[PDB]
């Protein structure tokens with residue numbers, strides 16, 4: 001393309017070029033094709049629409065993210081404020097999210113579900129085993145990404161959520177802080193697996209978040225759970241979305257499950 005011949009912007013350090021090639025857009029981000037000028041690898045140049053405290057915590061967040069290298073984590077390269085928008089440079093995932101990828105297909109193949117879910121678990125395991133552990137807290141099919149031509153599946157949007165009761169005057173500061181452990185990622189994984197397995201959004205029968213909350217704090221499963229054909233798939237999902245977090249499967253349990261073991265390849269025909 002002509003568009004690939006002419007950069008339209010450069011990062012402050014000169015490392016990354018932006019091209020006027022729009023790869024995707026959502027409510028929060030617009031992603032362009034970029035280029036790493038040192039390696040000539042194409043990257044994702046993501047533009048997002050804060051106090052000096054939030055600015056410093058962000059830079060520290062980004063420095064840690066730069067160290068997170070793993071085959072099932074979208075790699076994070078750099079970030080800065082441009083003037084106006086915020087720019088994050090990450091690994092480019094050519095096929096967008098798993099949510100969009102699933103819209104092209106009618107019924108899930110067991111080999112694909114196996115393979116995608118195994119990759120997601122390894123990414124979560126990688127995050128949970130950092131020093132200190134990283135809990136994604138926002139895992140969903142719309143921030144799990146895929147490169148069509150390899151079938152590589154990688155967790156993205158890490159840190160994005162945290163980048164954007166009582167009476168406030170009388171509220172102790174520690175009541176704003178939320179601590180989650182690994183099990184909220186396991187629950188979210190279970191719902192991703194359910195969505196992949198049914199080609200259907202979970203709790204779609206609900207109209208609002210409160211209805212889901214009434215269902216989800218009453219511990220009654222989404223209608224799609226029963227539309228799961230394979231009993232072993234139903235059992236894995238059930239073990240991930242159990243209401244009481246101490247009853248939930250662990251990531252290690254899931255990854256050791258024979259369901260996720262790889263096969264011996266497809267026979268030549």
Ligand SMILES: Nc1ncnc2c1c(-c1cnc3[nH]ccc3c1)nn2C1CCCC1
Pocket residue numbers: 023024025026029030031044046074088090091092093094095096097145156157158160
């Ligand atoms: N790396 C990518 N490659 C290809 N497409 C991508 C992405 C991302 C994306 C993925 N992970 C990210 N982490 C912080 C910002 C960010 C942006 N978002 N998008 C699309 C833009 C909105 C729908 C998905």
Ligand code: NA
Pocket residue numbers: 020022
């Ligand atoms: Na454009």
